[PDB]
A paper describes a structure:
We obtained a palisade map at a subnanometer resolution, which reveals a trimeric structure as a single conformer. We found that most of the density in our palisade map is unambiguously explained by a model of the processed N-terminal fragment 1 of A10. Ordered densities that would account for the C-terminal fragments 2 and 3 were not identified, suggesting that only fragment 1 of A10 is a structural component of the palisade trimer. An AlphaFold2 model of an A10/A4 heterodimer revealed that an alpha helix of A4 (residues 24–66) located in a groove in the A10 model predictably accounts for the unexplained density. Our maps, therefore, indicate that the palisade consists of an A10 trimer in which each protomer binds a long alpha helix located near the N-terminus of A4, where the N-terminus of this helix points toward the inner wall and the C-terminus points toward the viral membrane. Within the trimer, each A10 monomer consists of three regions: the A4-interacting domain (residues 169–364), which forms the projecting lobes at the apex of the trimer and mediates the interaction with A4; the medial domain (residues 38–168 and 365–431), which encloses a cavity in the center of the trimer base; and the inner wall-proximal domain (residues 1–37 and 432–614), which forms the base of the trimer and interacts with the inner core wall. In total, each inter-protomer interface consists of approximately 2,285 Å2 of the buried surface area.
The boundary of the core is defined by a pseudohexagonal palisade layer, composed of trimers projecting from an inner wall. In contrast, A4 and A10, which are essential for virion assembly, are accessible on the surface of intact viral cores suggesting that they are palisade components. Moreover, A10 and A4 form a stable complex that can be cross-linked in purified IMVs.
Author numbering:
A (entry chain A), B (entry chain C), C (entry chain E): 1 to 594
D (entry chain D), E (entry chain B), F (entry chain F): 24 to 66
Write the structure that this text describes.
Amino acid sequence: MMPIKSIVTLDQLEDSEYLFRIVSTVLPHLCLDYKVCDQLKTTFVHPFDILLNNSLGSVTKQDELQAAISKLGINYLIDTTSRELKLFNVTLNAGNIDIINTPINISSETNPIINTHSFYDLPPFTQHLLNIRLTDTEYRARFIGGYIKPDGSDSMDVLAEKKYPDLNFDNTYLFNILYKDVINAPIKEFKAKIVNGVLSRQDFDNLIGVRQYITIQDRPRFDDAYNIADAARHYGVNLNTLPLPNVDLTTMPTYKHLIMFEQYFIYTYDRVDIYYNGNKMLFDDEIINFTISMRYQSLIPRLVDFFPDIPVNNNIVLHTRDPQNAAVNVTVALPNVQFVDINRNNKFFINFFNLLAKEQRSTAIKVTKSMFWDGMDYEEYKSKNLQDMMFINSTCYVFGLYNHNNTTYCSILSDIISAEKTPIRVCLLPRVVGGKTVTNLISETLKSISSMTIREFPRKDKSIMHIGLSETGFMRFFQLLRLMADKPHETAIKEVVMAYVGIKLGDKGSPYYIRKESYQDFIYLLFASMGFKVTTRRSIMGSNNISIISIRPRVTKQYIVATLMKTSCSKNEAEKLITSAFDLLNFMVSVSDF
Amino acid sequence: MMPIKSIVTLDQLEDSEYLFRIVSTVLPHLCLDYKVCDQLKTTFVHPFDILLNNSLGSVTKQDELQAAISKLGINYLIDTTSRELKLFNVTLNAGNIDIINTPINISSETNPIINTHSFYDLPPFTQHLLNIRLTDTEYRARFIGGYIKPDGSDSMDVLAEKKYPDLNFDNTYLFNILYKDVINAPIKEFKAKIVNGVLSRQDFDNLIGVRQYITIQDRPRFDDAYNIADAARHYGVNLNTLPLPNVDLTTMPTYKHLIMFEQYFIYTYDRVDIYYNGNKMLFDDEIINFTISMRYQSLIPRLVDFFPDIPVNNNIVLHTRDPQNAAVNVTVALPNVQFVDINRNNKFFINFFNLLAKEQRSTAIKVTKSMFWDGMDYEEYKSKNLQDMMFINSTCYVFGLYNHNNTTYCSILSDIISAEKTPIRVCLLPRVVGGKTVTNLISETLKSISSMTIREFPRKDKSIMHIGLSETGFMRFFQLLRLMADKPHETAIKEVVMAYVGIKLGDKGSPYYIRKESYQDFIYLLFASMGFKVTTRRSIMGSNNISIISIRPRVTKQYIVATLMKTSCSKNEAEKLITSAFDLLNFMVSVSDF
Amino acid sequence: MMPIKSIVTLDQLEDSEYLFRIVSTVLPHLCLDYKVCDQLKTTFVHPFDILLNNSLGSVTKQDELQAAISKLGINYLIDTTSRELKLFNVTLNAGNIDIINTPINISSETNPIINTHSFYDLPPFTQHLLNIRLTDTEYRARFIGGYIKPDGSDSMDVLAEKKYPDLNFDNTYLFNILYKDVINAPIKEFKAKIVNGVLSRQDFDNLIGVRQYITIQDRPRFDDAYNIADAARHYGVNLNTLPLPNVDLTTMPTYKHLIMFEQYFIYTYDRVDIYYNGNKMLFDDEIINFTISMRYQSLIPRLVDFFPDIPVNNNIVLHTRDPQNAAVNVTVALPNVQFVDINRNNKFFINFFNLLAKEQRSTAIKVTKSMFWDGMDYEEYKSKNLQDMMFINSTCYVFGLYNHNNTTYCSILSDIISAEKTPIRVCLLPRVVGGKTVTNLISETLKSISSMTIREFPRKDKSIMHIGLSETGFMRFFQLLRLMADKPHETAIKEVVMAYVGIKLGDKGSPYYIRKESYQDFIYLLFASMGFKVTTRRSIMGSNNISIISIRPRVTKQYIVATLMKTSCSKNEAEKLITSAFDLLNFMVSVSDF
Amino acid sequence: SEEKDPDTKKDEAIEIGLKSQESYYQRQLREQLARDNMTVASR
Amino acid sequence: SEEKDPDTKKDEAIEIGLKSQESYYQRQLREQLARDNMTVASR
Amino acid sequence: SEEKDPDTKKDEAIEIGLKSQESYYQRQLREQLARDNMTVASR
């Protein structure tokens, strides 16, 4: 009576041994005609993993990936400028991403189903996303993973008590944020790019604009923090012949630079005085409400669509002083102009207007239904056949979406069922080995064997010193043979035959010549793993300790063909397996009387 | 020759597969008369897990839980106000608990036995406690887990070099601390509660008292930080008609508010001047020593019981100035009054006096011996029978307490034995699935089957499309059948029969109708898992690919009864198993000639 | 068809069960003459683990350990004073080490092969090192793990884009840093030791020197922060009769104390004025460049060997004022003196000069090739025999070194091969149980059995109540019997025989007397585990429920001898196994007719 | 919930007792200071 | 890479449009203020 | 433990050598400054 936790789930090994159960506990029960679902031939990988390592993009659906990149870009900007609790727990820096080691908050809103998986086979942001998805609300997971709701009535809205706005347009935000070469200024809020060792032209012109509004006292510290002098010299710009700024809001030609000062620089440098029609302004709150309203007048209705409660007025009051130092309240009421108050979260609302302004000049992104995010209905899942359910639960992580306390949560499907919760939907993530989805590996394998015209069974030959696999094929195969044990002989044959073929299908290299020293031990392992009774007679003849290898039952065309026909869905399958495993069968037959 | 780490301990899976070994590797060797120990039918769960998720309380012993809640409440207050190293590594906030991501300190006092378990099946504070218990001193574990020493000589004291005081009385500290609705003031030390959107009456009256002692300059910032104006308006209190405070310690009617100012507010606001009999006080250390001694005179002896070295005097010296600005040392010596000096750690000693004052007006908490904390003596453990040891090591985590370098440590029992240390005691934690202890699940299962009057063995019927389990029962059972393999046929029968019954005993739902598409594959899996030779003859008849299922040996009353009688402790047991598994046996017999 | 991740790698259990596969899946295929490689009989353990717990040193090679201690000491000082990114992520404090909970940075330079191992069986710094080695560059791993390149052409240099200097000399840095008793001053940069409750003599004399250069205003705060008054009183030193310092750089007798002030104290205390030949110095940069150059003149060429670009000049310019307050630039040019500029990282370069100065007065450390760090060439590995490869992959963690993007990385060897990367070298770490390398345990076991003169096979005896193992031996053995199941009878015998002997070889204690209550269940478990058909006839005779145990096939000298001869490399081996397992075989033969 | 912390009533009883003791000692104090003030106004 | 962010050209078109709208409203503003200044210089 | 750090004696030998070199260079310095002072007191 063995201990319990010993049947590891399909989910806690390394890659090679996670290939072994596919090869021994999915593939031998699939008939060669079995069609793997096409949606399962790609898998989800988190955009961060791919931006840092583009090779990981290979197993993903490109159109879902590009969409997720642009979507994450937007969601991150919203969250980062929000004063509300951050949904992200990573920091995007120049050239790298930090996972932040946030305290584990535990509350009434934590998923009441505990997660018993570690997911150490997945790329680190993909792994990180899953940990969040299974411990938190499904809303948070979708937001951080750059989910876009696909077109159609069969996309499911998730219950959550609070939500951010949902903007959707193509953009390059992540590529700009992750740009490696930036000035490491004490203010991190403005990521001034370095191009060819010099501050970028776009950023230089911007900073030159902002500089005009800094005081005479603070300009040195500014110029130093961004190396403006070198940039000016490189760009030919004589700083001494820059004009005085027009500090009057009425005749100022663009508020862009004043808004940038307020957005990134007010909290570190002193500003010059700002005027309205000759009168000095008394409140920066009024300056920022005026300038934003004037600059983004056309987007104010669209802001109100997300924030109905936001104050919008047909006028604004500016508290000013005249040159004679008398307090003058100026009420500004221009034809067909509206003024919005953004004071309680200026940094967010300024950035939100920029997102809206870009959206109005970008196309919206369309996506198909994601098996990872949207999944399938629980009834649709339960309608499937027993082989499909075995295949899914043996090639994908399997999740469910469920509701509790008016919130949607995600958990492993078994655990929802065990906690007596009812799954609404089943979500899937096809597992990956050697840069392919395992589902697709199986699909390709079945297709390839199915496509082979049947060859003759190999005839007994002399001195075959290879099984046709290359060095890297042979070494993978040899590791797998060490894992093949105690199984019924007939099945052990089919499993080893299918292992060889699954490797042979990716095996680019010239055949590997088995070293003479290894040759007998290889023979032993191969026939023992297949469940043949290998018998090694050591006979001392004179001074020499001769080892003779006897294999029973005898390897013959009839024995193998009969043994595979029992374990195959048809005779054709058995003959196509024989055809695909030709080199191995040629080896075996040639050494059976050794 | 397979790899090593493949026999996963009873401790590293998910729940469903951790039910499978109970059902296949404990339950078929227990006779129906086996009595599970009653202490093992509940289990320990950390109070924090339960305060946030009350459902987790269900598997615990209520009287140990209520005790632990009150005890943790006390221990946390001591530790939090201590200037010594924090034994807790969590922060209790309003509505939630943060696990703090503390640096992993490693020292000469770290448990010299390494821990090789991760405990991902346990609630997060329960898991967290175990990690600490196994890596640190047993003293720390008991303190943070709210252990109370039970009445009796058989409670083991643990060696540790330093210890906090051990107070024990019923209280509601945790419910107050975890109260979700509080003003988010810049000073976090005073958790002012919000009730119906307004600061609480008790807190308002308190803050109004404290306010009297704040300076005219700082009152605005105070009133703003706690929204006193709204609270005053709501409570009808005219702030302008509050009286001037009596700032003379001699005629001051209560020191309560002055002490609160010193405890929560001195570090953020300026105080008014304090007087003694007309003379201004020069030192706050003297003010706090005087006021505390006068307020808590009756508890001073009880403080000395925990802190013998604390200075207690029959007089105190107050350094003052007269109105004429001459330094006057006043020696105060009142009949039957003693003065304590708490300068070392005023914040702790003020809070400690409050705990003592509450204890003097609360009952002490009594608890029984905990199998988790106190365990059993190692000799008592070794005196047990071989089945009990198998049952314990297959239904509980098993720990030992041992001494090294004059400190008591806890480690997994195997690892103490392997490190050639001698266990003093064995401590147990019954594992949990589906909201029950597994020990109790087994106890209930055995009882239920034992209680069944024996029915007739089912007769062969037509068109049975269900095994009597509901949908959720059937799906749990179906998952388990996919795990059942390669076992001796007779045992494989008893294990599958016991699996069905263990599910059937919790299976509230109407029977699930096996879909026609699934029906043959279910038949195959069921008989194959039981180790019957299932033979599926595919015969092409005309255009139709007919599959005929042949099961050997034939399912008959004699075959099953004989097969179960071999694997059962008595004939009665076999017949009670047949009786409990009636629907399944009716299915089997009805499809055996299909 | 069971799930995949269930053949746990040789790498995810606890210790006892990781002994079981050695005993059942390495040892029964080794012939008694097999020579374990000597390099594999020790293993690497991280110096920090051993400095805190000296017992862990036992499995290591002493000469590699002492070397690593001295090397880490140097590397840490370099890294700690570096302004470049820290390669270490631990803090060495007095008496303890903190692992710092650093953000997980992920970049283009992260190892593109993911790590699927957790290594929870290794000491915490050893485990921590491996996590870094497998996720980061091999350069970082070698630097933090105190690797020293061994003498010889077969030591591989690792590609990395940037490297620290590589100094190598014997030292005691780690013992000084980890010294438990130090003043907890607000400045942590100077770890003033406490000896017998008083500040150390060496530190006291040092601080007294430094004090001279502190201003009259700051001396009180200094004297308080280091408790100088008590130290002075204890050391008899009258502080009032200390001389005025010679503040003129020309006639100052040692710059040691001024340099120490600049190194540890300038950032917290005001200095007195410094003079050159009567003129006041204007820049601390010039003071530190002068004093260092004068103090360490002989090491300047050696600094230039590591830092060619560092400015070295035959003169220096000191900006000064005369007593008449006129600015005077003094150019100092002394015969055979050179001046180095260290301003851009003074703290590092001051500490680097100290390391060089100590190296010039210490011997260099020599080490042999490390199987952990240097490993073997991949071709040399591939040249090995199949049993050696099985033994290595069953007793060691197995790693490879590979190149990508002009950087060397380390990963598990399977994963390099699976990612289609080519390993350059194979690196090994022998796993440890019960304070020995497993490799060595096997070596010792094989030797011991081989060395036994053959005894007679035991004769059937009455009332044998023990198997010769002690209590602790018996209880380890009994756990192992619960893990022995379903194996072929002949092999199950050899495996249980080898388990007994492997325990018996470390079993110091007097035989354990099997309790009468346990005796039948032990008999059952032992013969069942060995794959004997145990048959337990329960016969009710009168009121008594008699159990008779029948074992088949019958235990006889011929049966056992024949059965072991099948599974042994020679008859001699079978007879030496019988000889080593004598007590167990005496038990078995004495209970076979029970 | 302010209504349903039973300790609110224990705690009121606790404060009443502490303030009662405190008031007693404050009176013993003011009585001692009264005796001392009267004797100082005559010495 | 400055040359190969296509958005650099979208963003220029975006800024041009925003500054254009902003310039329009700044002109409506200065026109309103001109009308008001002339009427104040005569009232 | 102060008595049983052998490096205390290596380190004393190290300081002695450093202070010796330092004293030598301080003397070369004061000699150069003496030559320069005497020549300045006559130029």
